[PDB]
Amino acid sequence: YRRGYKFSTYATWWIRQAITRSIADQARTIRIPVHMIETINKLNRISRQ
DNA sequence: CCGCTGCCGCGAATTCCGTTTCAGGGTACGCCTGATAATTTGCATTTTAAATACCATTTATTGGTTACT
């Protein structure tokens, strides 16, 4: 709290990180590593636009 | 105070054939670091123009002359 910021501002980053890291590790039968998941997500975001 | 309702379970033929093996989620980014998977040399075993060291039984040259168109 010494930083003087609202709690939610800090907490949201950790929550997003945890959720996304898990959805990368689990959720596939054959486990693609994290970095490849990031690259595939970039690929898909570029393809739509 | 031993009757009836209402829930929930469970089941519904046989072979072949055909066919599109097929798609859909809507969320970030940049560091250190060890952790494998690549790539680089030497040493065991073949295989060595062949070269080599002995046994082998079977023709070859043979030892030519004594009879004689």
Side-chain angles (χ1 to χ4, degrees):
Chain A
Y1 73 101
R2 192 60 45 67
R3 199 71 171 265
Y5 280 100
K6 180 67 75 176
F7 175 70
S8 311
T9 298
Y10 193 40
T12 302
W13 291 71
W14 287 104
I15 290 173
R16 286 188 188 275
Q17 180 256 4
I19 281 177
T20 301
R21 182 171 174 84
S22 80
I23 197 169
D25 285 331
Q26 303 157 1
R28 287 216 180 190
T29 317
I30 300 156
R31 201 199 98 243
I32 295 302
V34 179
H35 290 357
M36 271 315 108
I37 297 295
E38 300 307 347
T39 60
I40 305 170
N41 281 8
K42 269 175 174 165
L43 197 42
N44 276 337
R45 297 183 280 172
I46 294 180
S47 284
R48 305 205 287 263
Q49 178 204 359

